Design a protein around this nucleic acid. Structure first.
Lengths: 233, 60, 249, 68, 121
RNA sequence: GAUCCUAAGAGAUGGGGAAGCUCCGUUUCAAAGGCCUGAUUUUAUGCAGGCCACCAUCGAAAGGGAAUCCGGUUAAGAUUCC
RNA sequence: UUAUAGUUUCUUUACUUAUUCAAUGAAGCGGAGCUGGAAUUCAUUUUCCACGUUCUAGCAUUCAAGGUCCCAUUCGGGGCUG
């Protein structure tokens, strides 16, 4: 206090060699990071066809939350739960000799692409969840259009990882509830109506309209300057 | 490498880096300009204070 | 027929530049934040010779704004630049000999040198001895300034393209006769291997398109087409005219 | 099976969809190396028709030869 | 979100766990015996009259050493075998393409005592 | 003396060309490891003071370069043997 | 006759994102906000108007000042400014 004196630093042009501040905007990123970004930007910049653009409109995070709360039940049997059920069944094949009636009917979520595609084609599905981030999109580009034509209620849900965690895989790229317990048919019926409001009903309109054709923030600001030039003079 | 510092360094400011004339000339340069930078500081501060205090004679 | 001297110069084996005795690449310090928004002060620490080039190089010590260093930069000394004097490089830098300001931040009629073709080039034009650009005109609307090059050609450069003020030193170097062969020999010995040139006409017809004959003579027109193939050009390429003119060039 | 819908879609190469995907992927591939690896088949239906299976040992490798 | 401050304008390879080698099987499993042992190092003595003049006079032992034998290994070999402290070892390779070494002993041992011990005179 | 350093240069690497033998380039459109202080004494292992980074290698028995002299000695070695 | 916006049909411009040419060890880009001193229509929700370093061959590197929680007030190390 009596012997320590306050000083200017003066980080102008000349004085005080500039301090180690944040250069996180100016990092020469690895080519793999640079490429995954520049691809995401370029996919938005070029005009997106309306059948690709329909995957941008993902299900909102309260309808999604409730969908996943219903889908949390009917999780496919675990490796342990399978083993124990097989030990009871295979034991009852000797004790009583009553096989394929023991181990009561399973209500699980249907999953795997070529499985659920066929369940939609046969019109056995009651709710189909379609992932929005499948590595080659083409795997899924046809699925909302097939799902509508057959008249199965479908929703584009956020996260193939989220679907994967629900089916005990890493990723599932698709999910489908074809049956339900009598108790939980009411919730399914409501959640089907609220997802049909977003996806099914609006399909015919969203089919027409393109995504992308969106400038970068610097070119946005330039156009907004060059538009205020002529008209707002 | 194995010689005393005495042999290759005269006991002064820069010693075995600069001459006695070169070191004194940069002392006089260092201090003088530090006193001309402190007189600049006040001359510019009183040219600020003058332009501020006498600018408000006109809007009246 | 053989591959001509002219043809095999471009293979670049022996015909490469003699680059041991040179100080380094003479450039302007990179276009950075300090030069864009203000200017940096540099000290002409020494003025040195460079081999194969007849214009002194001003080694000028600048600072590093970001780390604790003195980034030394090698300039081409403008005439009247001296040792210890302060060079000022940037937009806001004053209009004195030695100073490095963009052509946009300069009035018309200035004699500038070591100019950039593009902004961020680090010197391209008027870099040789006793040569300079004259900034003729301007236009802030599509910010591009008109300049007159030592050749007498009018170009249009960006307003952010920099240039050093004054003429490049060592002027009048060409107006003394070189003298007795050996002077030329020694001049060339530190630039390139383009010296004592044999006349194609004095060769055999293998060696050059001018060779042969029972008299030394070219025999056909020395004015060669622009569309002549790489190997056919010997004489005057795309000669708009020839001969010594009367009055003014 | 989604594989039939993939096979049929992939033939219509100038359909608005494949036009877009051609433009964005050819960029992604050009930015990577000449001979680089592939984490999975870009065409999982074309792959398996040629004899690819999704078990350990089988690999895919993307490669770009100069035209002309 | 709120991504970390980077004072550097360059990204560099993050440091990761260099794991130690832990093989399922030994490479050789039977390790080699000592290639150059004491007797492989010191092959023979040199019985030339010049070598003998140097043994009698100089207090030196002229020994035919292997190639691929360090002056350190000659010193260590002579000490271990012959029970003698070596003051120095000067080695030249002969025009015959074999090495020979002038093993000088300390003042304590007269070279004739150890020359006669070996057998050669 | 070689060994070490770099010179005109030669050359892997990343990469890109080429049907291929291999060719270009050597800092390039690369995520290109090393340095020291104690730590803490868990039969010695986890820290941090923290720093620093456009980056192989080969290339001179005349260039750069840590340090030796005298006397004596052998048939023939000695700036080395004594 | 044009009033559907259902293709470039041909020619005059424009957009970035492919492609392209540079440069940096990818530091300060773009938009806005301060302080402007002011624009006077008049102290503004109106739009024009800059953004810490210059006589001198010196120096400038390890976050100091205020402020806030911990260290039970030892040792200091930490938030935001600067």
């Amino acid at each position: 206090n009596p012997l320590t004196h306050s000083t200017p630093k003066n980080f102008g042009i000349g004085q005080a060699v500039q301090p180690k501040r944040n250069l996180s905007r100016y990092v020469k990123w690895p080519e793999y990071v640079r490429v995954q970004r520049q691809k995401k930007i370029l996919s938005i910049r070029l005009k997106v066809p309306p059948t690709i653009a329909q995957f941008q409109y993902t299900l909102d995070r309260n309808t999604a939350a409730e969908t996943f709360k219903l889908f949390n039940k009917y999780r496919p049997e675990t490796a342990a739960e399978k083993k124990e059920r097989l030990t009871k069944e295979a034991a009852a094949v000797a004790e009583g000799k009553s096989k394929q009636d023991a181990s009561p009917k399973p209500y699980a979520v249907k999953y795997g692409l070529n499985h659920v595609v066929a369940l939609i084609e046969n019109k056995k599905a009651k709710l189909v969840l379609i992932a929005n981030d499948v590595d080659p999109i083409e795997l899924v580009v046809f699925l909302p259009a097939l799902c509508k034509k057959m008249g199965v209620p479908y929703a584009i849900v956020k996260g193939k990882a989220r679907l994967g965690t629900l089916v005990n895989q890493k990723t599932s790229a698709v999910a489908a509830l074809t049956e339900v317990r009598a108790e939980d048919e009411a919730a399914l019926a409501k959640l089907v109506s609220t997802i049909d409001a977003n996806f099914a009903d609006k399909y015919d309109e969203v089919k027409k309209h393109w995504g992308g054709g969106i400038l970068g923030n610097k070119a946005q600001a330039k156009m907004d300057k060059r538009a205020k030039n002529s008209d707002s003079a | 490498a194995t010689v005393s510092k005495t042999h290759k360094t005269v006991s002064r400011a820069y010693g075995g880096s600069r001459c006695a004339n070169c070191v004194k000339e940069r002392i006089i340069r260092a201090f003088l300009i530090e006193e001309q930078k402190i007189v600049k500081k006040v001359v510019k501060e009183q040219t600020e204070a003058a332009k501020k205090s006498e600018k408000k004679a006109k809007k009246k | 027929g053989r591959v001509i001297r002219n043809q095999r110069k471009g293979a670049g084996s022996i015909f490469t530049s003699h680059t041991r005795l040179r100080q380094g690449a003479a450039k302007l310090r990179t276009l950075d934040y300090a030069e864009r928004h203000g200017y940096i002060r540099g000290i002409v620490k020494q003025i040195v010779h460079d081999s194969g080039r007849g214009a002194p190089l001003a080694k000028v010590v600048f600072r590093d704004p970001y780390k604790y260093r003195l980034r030394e930069e090698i300039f081409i000394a403008n005439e009247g630049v001296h040792t210890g004097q302060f060079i000022y490089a940037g937009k806001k830098a004053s209009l004195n000999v030695g100073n490095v300001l963009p052509l946009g931040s300069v009035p018309e009629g200035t004699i500038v040198s070591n100019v950039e073709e593009k902004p961020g080039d680090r010197g391209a034009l008027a870099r040789a001895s006793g040569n300079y650009v004259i900034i003729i005109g301007h236009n802030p609307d599509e910010n591009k300034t008109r300049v007159r090059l030592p050749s007498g050609a009018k170009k249009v450069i960006s307003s952010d393209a920099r240039g050093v003020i004054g003429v490049i030193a060592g002027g009048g170097r060409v107006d003394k006769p070189l003298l007795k062969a050996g002077r030329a020999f020694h001049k060339y010995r530190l630039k390139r291997n383009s010296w004592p040139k044999t006349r194609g006409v004095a060769m055999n017809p293998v060696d050059h398109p001018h060779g042969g004959g029972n008299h030394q003579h070219i025999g056909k027109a020395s004015t060669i087409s622009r569309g002549a193939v790489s190997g056919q050009k010997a004489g005057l390429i795309a000669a708009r005219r020839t001969g010594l003119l009367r009055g003014s060039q | 099976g989604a594989y039939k819908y993939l096979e049929e879609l992939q033939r219509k190469k100038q359909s608005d969809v494949l036009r877009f995907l051609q433009r964005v992927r050819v960029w992604e591939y050009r930015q990577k190396n000449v001979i680089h690896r592939a984490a999975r088949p870009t065409r999982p239906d074309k792959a398996r028709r040629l004899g690819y299976k999704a078990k350990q040992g089988f690999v895919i490798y993307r490669v770009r030869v100069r035209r002309g | 979100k709120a991504l970390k401050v980077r004072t550097s304008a360059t990204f560099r390879l993050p440091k990761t766990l260099k794991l130690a080698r832990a093989p399922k099987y030994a490479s050789k499993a039977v390790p080699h015996y000592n290639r150059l042992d004491s007797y492989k190092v010191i092959e023979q003595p040199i019985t030339s009259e010049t070598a003998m003049k140097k043994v009698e006079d100089g207090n030196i032992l002229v020994f035919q050493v292997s190639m691929k034998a360090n002056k350190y290994q000659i010193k260590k070999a002579v000490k271990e075998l012959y029970e003698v402290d070596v003051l120095k070892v000067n080695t030249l390779v002969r025009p015959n393409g074999t090495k020979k070494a002038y093993v000088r002993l300390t003042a304590d041992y007269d070279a004739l005592d150890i020359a006669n011990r070996i057998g050669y005179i």
